[PDB]
């Protein structure tokens, strides 16, 4: 259906020696497709999906210059922000930034975003209108006043509504074999006695894509929230995801409980029973 492209940048200062560590990752939906790591040997933006490997040498040169430029801007900003927050030169600090766009089923622009954080707290974010800034505190307010005067939001709006969506459309086309394919969860239930009179039922969803899923238990056709445990969705390490939900039940009453699985890859929600 709808799709997204997102870049995640992290800069971490190294007060003991040298320049900050800079890491950049790009995603299309739940698929990582590019990376840059200032500690890696290449000093280049690298491919991480087969469908991007086809891009010309100019694509790789431009992407490399862009992330190396941001890494230097982040290094300057770490110094500026240390001053804003009246911090010492001895501690390690972090700047993170995420930006991207969402397109609908027809490829049209839906939403754009560009937000950043200092030491894991919101600093400055482009509002949904892509015209103005939300500053979380007085240090971010100093940045907002400088950026309001310098057409910064206009440049982000032009990129998010243009370049961002055009490249996302190309990636979705080139990587359609995987990016536009859903992997339905492979589901199964396991049984684990907790005593001679109680047992845990655990409903598994494996090897699915995209990561969004809903796993719920019902007892006699109504939602069961008591005695349940739902783990956070986790990566399998092969590009797919995993999740399980469990409930403790009295032995002999297992048939009252049904697990319900909702995923984009399933035309109709799935129902499992022990």
């Amino acid at each position: 259906g709808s799709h997204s492209m997102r870049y995640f940048y992290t800069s971490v200062s190294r007060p003991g020696r040298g320049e900050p560590r800079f890491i950049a990752v790009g995603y299309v939906d739940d698929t990582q497709f590019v990376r840059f790591d200032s500690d890696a040997a290449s000093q280049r933006m690298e491919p991480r999906a087969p469908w991007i490997e086809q891009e010309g040498p100019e694509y790789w040169d431009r992407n490399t210059r862009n992330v190396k430029a941001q890494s230097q801007t982040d290094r300057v900003d770490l110094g500026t922000l240390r001053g804003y927050y009246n911090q010492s030169e001895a501690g390690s600090h972090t700047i993170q930034m995420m930006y991207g766009c969402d397109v609908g089923s027809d490829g049209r622009f839906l939403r754009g975003y560009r937000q950043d954080a200092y030491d894991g707290k919101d600093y400055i974010a482009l509002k949904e209108d892509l015209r103005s800034w939300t500053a979380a505190d007085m240090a971010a307010q100093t940045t907002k006043h400088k950026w309001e005067a310098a057409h910064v939001a206009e440049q982000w709006r032009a990129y998010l509504e243009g370049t961002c969506v055009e490249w996302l459309r190309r990636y979705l086309e080139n990587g359609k074999e995987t990016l536009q394919r859903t992997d339905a969860p492979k589901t199964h239930m396991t049984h684990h006695a907790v005593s001679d009179h109680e047992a845990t039922l655990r409903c598994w969803a494996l090897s699915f894509y995209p990561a969004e899923i809903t796993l719920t238990w019902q007892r006699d056709g109504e939602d069961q929230t008591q005695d349940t445990e739902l783990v956070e969705t986790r990566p399998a390490g092969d590009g797919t995801f995993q999740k399980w939900v469990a409930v403790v039940v009295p032995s002999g009453q297992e048939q009252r409980y049904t697990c319900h699985v909702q995923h984009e890859g399933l035309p109709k929600p799935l129902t499992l029973r022990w």
């Binding site: 694509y59 801007t73 400055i124 370049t163 961002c164």
Partner: peptide
Amino acid sequence: DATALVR
């Protein structure tokens, strides 16, 4: 395709 002023 990745893409900005100093803070």
